[PDB]
Design a protein around this nucleic acid. Structure first.
Lengths: 341, 235
DNA sequence: GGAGGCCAAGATCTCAAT
DNA sequence: GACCCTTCGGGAGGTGCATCCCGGTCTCGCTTGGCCTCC
């Protein structure tokens, strides 16, 4: 029973990005910000927590193994209890709200639910945000522009037959016509928008009405298209991300960690290192990181930190330093009482 | 029980703060920090230690620890943001390598994600984004410095899971007047209604953890208060 | 023949932008 | 094998010409009944 504080850094080998609903406006894609567009962004601790919870779930799945028939021994209910923390059938224990140290038996039997809680049981694992260190460590990556594979490489036309070439020509013509028509409709809509502010309070309704009707006219115009509903050639919008080699401060903790729960957490971090990526846009290999955490605890009876070791995750391997951490991992590996069902 | 002097703590806010109706108080943060430092969750033990680093007002039954007050600069002021939490059911989660789905005609019954017990939960909460967060207290500056810098505590709601209210650059500067409970007759923290202090009426415990214990009729300040950072540093 | 499962249907509309 | 004595100056430009175009997406966070096959 002790608190294990993980203080360290996260270095991005590749750009690190995340899509959040309230941060992604119609003007563009942005990282989460604690304020305006001039504030420094951050990588949410919710995303890191989700990635590490999935890693711990994978550790549990590997440990438990598969049944004789080869099917996983977890059904949907247990899967959602371990993954999302919801109870879908109402069969979960409902502890009394008064007490705090509740679920002692459940925390002893299911280390994953103890670390990352469920609804009705608080979790011992706190995972903080990844706050950048510098001041220009974010940029508009991605971007690009989808092209037409036959207007770029002429050798590909030799493969097409005559009917397919005719189909391609029809597709290009339809794309151009629809582009022009939709541009005209958008021009009219924007003209409405500019005079919308100058419009009177009574006029505030029917101008929005015409904007709406223009929108469904765009939709119907795109529906009229036959060869393709969407224009193949299009600019790709860039996504904001942390630059390569950005240093992000990360803080993680386990509150009242037994050796088994801390061992499960260390094992999750070990398994996380096989594919250590956060966030999305994995098609551009984004999210790949390397991190080193200084595992420390509190000296019993006084407010003095005690360093127990260090965990370093690199593309070349995982380095666990400190006899205490190995003791935690061994304690998790040797326990024979866990029941995750 | 120590030489306690009035201090003002100013921290830089890194993440939007979610306020659970009543503004977070510094004694709550210190209670969580001590619950992590002391490997104990018993309220009696943590409160017994918390009284060694925060002055306890016996007459009112509350710690000399003010509530949250956002510090606004001319560059950035108090803003409105939402705390977004979602279920990301990846192809790995929806895979037979993790669980065995129920089978009909050999096909696997898909998870109903638009609604039900197994829906993607798009839980969103109001949050506030300001450059600085400020608390007033009377206690040991060293212990509070250590707890704020090294413990896993934030300002607001559910910092453990969502990491809302992440802060850094904790600055503690001594004060001249104890402005931790009262100031010009207005309560700066949840105080008993009979204290004679003005503020918004409400029902809440007086000592942390504020989710545990009988909820008495209290008087607390407005949940969202802002002060200029220049006027906060004046001391 | 419930019983599992899918799919379509239900009101009107949301301004912030280096 | 002893030591003088180390230069002056002229003279530095002018011109054109500065392009055309595409093409900007799809979801979704709810519940229920109607209906298709299934055990």
């Amino acid at each position: 029973m002790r608190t294990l504080n993980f203080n360290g850094k996260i270095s991005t080998l590749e750009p690190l990005t995340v899509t959040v609903k309230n941060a992604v406006s119609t003007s563009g894609h942005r990282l989460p910000r604690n304020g305006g567009f001039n504030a420094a962004p951050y990588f949410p601790g919710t995303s890191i927590r989700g990635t590490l919870r999935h890693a711990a779930h994978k550790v549990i799945v590997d440990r438990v193994g598969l049944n004789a028939d080869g099917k996983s021994p977890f059904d949907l209910a247990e899967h959602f209890m371990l993954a999302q923390g919801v109870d879908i059938n109402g069969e979960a224990e409902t502890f009394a709200p008064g007490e705090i140290n509740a679920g002692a038996e459940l925390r002893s039997k299911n280390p994953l639910i103890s670390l990352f809680g469920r609804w009705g049981l608080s979790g011992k694992v706190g995972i903080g945000n990844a706050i950048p260190d510098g001041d220009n460590q974010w940029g508009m990556f991605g971007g690009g522009a989808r092209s037409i594979m036959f207007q770029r490489d002429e050798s590909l036309m030799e493969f097409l037959e005559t009917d397919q070439v005719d189909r391609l020509e029809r597709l290009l013509e339809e794309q151009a016509e629809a582009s022009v028509d939709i541009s005209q409709i958008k021009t009219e809509q924007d003209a409405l928008k500019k005079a919308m502010k100058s419009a009177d309070k009574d006029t505030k309704a029917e101008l929005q009405i015409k904007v709406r009707e223009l929108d469904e006219k765009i939709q119907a115009r795109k529906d009229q298209k036959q060869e393709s509903r969407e224009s193949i050639r299009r600019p790709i919008d860039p996504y904001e991300a942390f630059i390569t080699g950005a240093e992000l401060s990360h803080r993680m903790s386990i509150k009242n960690a037994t050796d088994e729960e801390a061992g499960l957490f260390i094992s999750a971090l070990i398994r996380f290192a096989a594919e250590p990526r956060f966030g999305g846009h994995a098609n551009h290999n984004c999210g790949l990181v390397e991190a080193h955490w200084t595992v420390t605890t509190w000296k019993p009876g006084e407010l003095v930190p005690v360093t127990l070791g260090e965990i370093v995750i690199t593309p070349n391997g995982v380095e666990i330093t400190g006899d205490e951490l190995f003791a935690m991992v061994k304690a998790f590996n040797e326990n024979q009482s866990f029941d995750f069902t | 029980m120590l030489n306690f002097k009035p201090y003002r703590v100013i921290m830089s806010s890194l993440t939007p703060v979610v306020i659970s109706g009543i503004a977070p108080s510094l004694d709550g943060i210190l209670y969580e920090a001590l619950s992590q430092a002391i490997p104990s969750n018993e309220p009696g033990v943590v409160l017994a230690r918390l009284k060694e680093i925060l002055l306890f007002n016996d007459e009112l039954g509350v710690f000399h620890a003010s509530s949250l007050r956002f510090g606004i600069t001319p560059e950035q002021g108090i803003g409105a943001t939402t705390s977004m939490r979602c279920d990301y059911l990846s192809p790995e989660k929806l895979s037979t390598a993790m669980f065995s789905p129920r089978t009909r005609r050999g096909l696997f019954t898909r998870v109903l994600l638009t609604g039900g017990p197994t829906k993607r939960r798009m839980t969103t909460r109001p949050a506030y984004s300001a450059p600085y967060l400020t608390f007033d207290f009377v206690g040991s500056s060293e212990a509070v410095e250590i707890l704020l810098n090294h413990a896993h505590v934030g300002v607001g709601y559910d910092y453990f899971s969502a990491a809302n209210g992440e802060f850094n650059n904790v600055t503690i500067l001594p004060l001249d007047i104890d402005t931790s409970i009262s100031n010009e007759g207005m309560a700066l923290r949840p105080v008993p209604v009979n204290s004679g202090l003005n503020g918004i009426k409400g029902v809440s415990p007086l000592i942390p953890p504020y989710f545990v214990g009988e909820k008495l009729n209290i008087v607390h300040p407005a949940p969202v208060r802002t002060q200029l950072i220049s006027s906060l540093l004046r001391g």
